[PDB]
Each structure stands twice: as structure tokens, then as C-alpha cells.
């Protein structure tokens, strides 16, 4: 029923066929973009080209991009593990137009690949349009032949894309597949492709102007679409990620499908193995600031859940070899960094397990001391201690405390943060005062 690897090739080849130029995936860390620590979408590297600043030999491009949404206005690390759709790392299959073909062509190639390449039924397919997108609806309903009953006219928060506050923007059309009456909602009508029509110029004023040369930018998550073709009810059960779940089962001696909590840890470990492998492979080294901290919190999270499963010895390092052997066909460079990634990961692990263990005992203790004493949160001191003494990331402490119904004293943490500061300066990272509380969720205690 089509393997992940197959779908990726079919997409790329299909578009080269449509004159698009296969563009190698940019690395996860933007070369000269101290702005974004991680490429989140296929378009990111083409940004300046859609802007018209940068030049490209071609007007049509297609690619499968290495993506990371553990960050910013596109940061799902928080949900990772709890749902069957969220990930840190993922692949975006996309086709782009640089002032060349637009709406119709965008819609035709999309409709042909879904119906004639992926082989999905034209009857279980739905498309959404910008409510006042007369052009889009018309082409969907008249040119393609989509029965009006299968087309939804939605608002701005649903089909109006924007690059930023001021910026090229425009309508978007999403193709959804109806997976059956045994499902419902955004799970039954699973969106698998979002086509973006950059038609307007949003002045600073918020005033929109047509673009002289409109552009096309599409995005289809690979795992999600593979899950549809392979008849799965989760992205973690697809050919390219299920073995990672199994990885967890074997090392834990626990099984997948028995209890939520366990499935949560298993999914966390699997999603984070891919994230850390592709991240370190692309140059990111664990540390306490920026990218290094993003990955460090990731590896930190996997370790903690792995221990939650009862795993007492380093293990994430063994998963690395699995990730590489699985994604080596589309990402051969991984075999060259396989042994380097494995070492960095084992170093972190061997370099972090014991502290996480003692930290977990400490944290649990105070939690239990809290709910026994009627407390409904962890003190600023209790947070700082596990943050500064056991090295726990601010978010990791919150998640742990969260499982018990307890939260953490946000203001008291901040107060404690200043104290240490005024303390350290009496008795690189660069924070603002009263923003120490915010920064800290992004750096290590040693950093502040």
C-alpha cells in the first residue's frame, strides 16, 4: 500500500515531470538565519526567492524538506507523544512556483497526484477554500469537478496564509481525505495537503495589494500521508516509525497498546530519536543555549520518559543506528555521521543519566510533599533547585509536576531567579531582568 520511501520518490519525480526542479533538502539549521534555529517548513529556504530578492535558475521547484517544529510560533514539542500526529522532526513534501504557474495549475497537479498517483478515491476527498475565494472554488468545482457538497468555504483563520505581520500572503486550499464513519472530526477528514496561494501584498498598514508575480507554495506531511495509504490510525504505526516504537518496547520490556502512559513514553522516544539524529547529523551539538539547548531538552525528555519506562542504562544511542538504517535511502549522508551522532548521543546520556535519576527522586518527593500538605504548586525554590541543582529544563519540570495535577510557581521562580542573580553578582547568555523567567525556559540554569 505504498511505503514512505515510495511516496516520497513518486512525489518528487511526479513534479520534475511537471517541469519542477528537484531541490535537495536544506539542512535543518539555516545557514545565515540566526533568527530561526530550525527550518520548520519546505518554503523556509526559498523565502528570499518568494520575496524576489534572491535569484534562482528555475521558476518551478519541488523538494522534500527536513523539518523541525519544536520551536516558536510553530513549536509542538509540548504535544509530542500525547497525540498520534505531532512530531519534533518531520518531512514536508512540497511544490513551489516563483511567479510562474498559479491557482489552477497548483490545483491540477495536486488533484492529479492524489487521484492518479497515490490512487485515493475522488469520492472520499474534500477540499477547503477561502470563503471569498471565487477563483479557487470555481476551479475546484468546475475545472476539477468537485461536487459542491465536497467543498467547504471557510474563513481567515482556516484558509488565509501569511508569511508575517507585514508580508506576501493570500488564500489557501487544503485537500482532506474522509477516512470513514468509524472516525470523526479532523481525524476522519484528515488533511493531507495544503496549497498556499501567495497573491497579496500586505503593507505595513494591513492593506493588501495584488502581487505582480504571484507565487505557489504547497505542503504535504509525509508521515501523515503515508499513514493514510498504509491504513494506519496513527503516524507512529507507519513503516518508517513503527520500528522505533518497537525499539522502545524491547528495551523496556513493555508493550505498545496496553496503557496510555506507556504509549506516551514509547511515542516520545520514537519521535525524539529521529529529531536528535537528524539534528546532530546536521551540525547541532548539545549545549545550554540556542539550538544546542533545543536538542538537549529533546534528549533530556526522551531519557526521562525512558527511565519512566524503567530503563536504567543509556539506550537512546542504540536507537540512533535504527534511525540511520531506516532513513538512509533518502538521506545517505546519515551513514557518514552515524558513528559521530551515536557518540555525541551516548556522551550526553552517560553524561546525564545519574543526575536525571536523582533529580526525579527529588522532584517526586516535593510533589508528594505538596499534595500531602495541601499545596497546589511547586515553589519557586523547588523549581530553581531542580532547575539549578539537577539541571532539569523548566518545561520538563512543569510536565512532571503536571502529571500530579500540580503546577509551578511562575512568579516565585522569577523572584528566585533575580535573587540568585543579585546573589551571584555580590556574594553566551544575555537576559533582561523580569524576563529571566521567560529566558530560562530556553536556556539552562547554568546559562542564567
UniProtKB/Swiss-Prot annotation:
It is found in: Cytoplasm. It catalyses: tRNA(Ala) + L-alanine + ATP = L-alanyl-tRNA(Ala) + AMP + diphosphate. It comes from the Bacteria. One of its GO terms (cellular component) is cytosol. Keywords: Aminoacyl-tRNA synthetase, ATP-binding, Cytoplasm, Ligase, Metal-binding, Nucleotide-binding, Protein biosynthesis, RNA-binding, tRNA-binding, Zinc. Its EC number is 6.1.1.7. GO terms for biological process: alanyl-tRNA aminoacylation. The keyword ATP-binding applies. It is an enzyme of class 6 (ligase). Binds 1 zinc ion per subunit. The keyword Acyltransferase does not apply. One of its GO terms (molecular function) is alanine-tRNA ligase activity. Consists of three domains; the N-terminal catalytic domain, the editing domain and the C-terminal C-Ala domain. The editing domain removes incorrectly charged amino acids, while the C-Ala domain, along with tRNA(Ala), serves as a bridge to cooperatively bring together the editing and aminoacylation centers thus stimulating deacylation of misacylated tRNAs. The Aquifex aeolicus domain can be used in vitro to replace the corresponding domain in E.coli. Belongs to the class-II aminoacyl-tRNA synthetase family. This is Alanine--tRNA ligase. It comes from Aquifex aeolicus (strain VF5). The chain holds residues 2 to 454 of 867 of the full protein.
Amino acid at each position: 500500500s505504498l511505503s514512505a520511501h515510495e511516496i516520497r520518490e513518486l512525489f518528487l519525480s511526479f513534479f520534475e515531470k511537471k517541469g519542477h526542479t528537484r531541490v535537495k533538502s536544506a539542512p535543518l539549521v539555516p545557514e545565515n538565519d540566526p533568527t530561526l534555529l530550525f527550518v520548520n517548513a519546505g518554503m523556509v529556504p526559498f523565502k528570499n526567492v518568494f520575496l524576489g530578492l534572491e535569484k534562482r535558475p528555475y521558476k518551478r521547484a519541488t523538494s522534500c524538506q527536513k523539518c523541525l517544529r519544536v520551536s516558536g510560533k510553530h513549536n509542538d514539542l509540548e504535544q509530542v507523544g500525547y497525540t498520534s500526529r505531532h512530531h519534533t522532526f518531520f518531512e514536508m513534501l512540497g511544490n513551489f512556483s516563483f511567479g510562474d504557474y498559479f491557482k489552477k495549475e497548483a490545483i491540477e497537479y495536486a488533484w492529479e497526484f492524489v487521484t492518479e498517483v497515490l490512487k485515493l478515491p475522488k469520492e472520499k476527498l474534500y477540499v477547503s477554500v477561502y470563503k471569498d475565494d471565487e477563483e479557487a472554488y470555481r476551479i475546484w468545482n468546475e475545472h476539477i469537478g468537485i461536487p459542491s457538497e465536497r467543498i467547504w468555504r471557510l474563513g481567515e483563520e482556516d484558509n488565509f496564509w501569511q508569511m508575517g505581520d507585514v508580508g506576501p500572503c493570500g488564500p489557501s486550499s487544503e485537500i482532506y481525505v474522509d477516512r470513514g464513519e468509524e472516525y470523526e472530526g479532523d481525524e476522519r477528514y484528515l488533511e493531507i495537503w495544503n496549497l498556499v496561494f501567495m497573491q497579496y501584498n500586505r503593507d505595513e498598514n494591513g492593506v493588501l495589494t495584488p502581487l505582480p508575480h504571484p507565487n505557489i507554495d504547497t505542503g504535504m506531511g509525509l508521515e501523515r500521508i503515508a499513514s493514510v495509504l498504509q491504513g494506519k490510525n496513527s503516524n507512529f504505526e507507519i513503516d518508517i516509525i513503527f520500528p522505533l516504537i518497537q525499539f522502545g518496547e524491547e528495551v523496556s520490556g513493555k508493550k505498545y497498546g496496553e496503557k496510555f502512559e506507556t504509549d506516551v513514553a514509547l511515542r516520545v522516544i520514537a519521535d525524539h530519536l529521529r529529531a536528535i539524529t537528524f539534528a546532530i547529523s546536521d551540525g547541532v551539538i548539545p549545549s545550554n543555549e540556542g539550538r544546542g539547548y533545543v536538542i538537549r531538552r529533546i534528549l533530556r525528555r526522551a531519557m526521562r520518559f525512558g527511565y519512566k519506562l524503567g530503563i536504567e542504562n543509556p539506550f537512546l544511542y542504540k536507537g540512533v543506528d535504527l534511525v540511520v538504517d531506516i532513513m538512509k535511502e533518502p538521506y545517505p549522508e546519515l551513514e557518514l555521521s552515524r558513528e559521530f551522532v551515536k557518540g555525541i548521543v551516548k556522551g550526553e546520556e552517560k553524561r546525564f543519566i545519574k543526575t536525571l535519576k536523582a533529580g526525579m527522586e527529588y522532584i517526586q518527593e516535593v510533589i508528594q510533599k505538596a499534595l500531602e500538605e495541601g499545596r497546589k504548586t511547586l515553589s519557586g525554590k523547588e523549581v530553581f533547585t531542580a532547575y539549578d541543582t539537577y539541571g532539569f529544563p523548566v518545561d520538563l519540570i512543569d510536565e512532571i509536576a503536571r502529571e500530579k495535577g500540580l503546577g509551578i510557581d511562575l512568579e516565585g521562580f522569577q523572584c528566585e531567579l533575580e535573587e540568585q542573580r543579585e546573589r551571584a553578582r555580590k556574594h553566551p547568555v544575555y537576559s533582561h531582568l523580569k524576563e529571566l523567567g521567560k529566558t530560562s525556559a530556553f536556556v539552562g540554569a547554568a546559562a542564567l
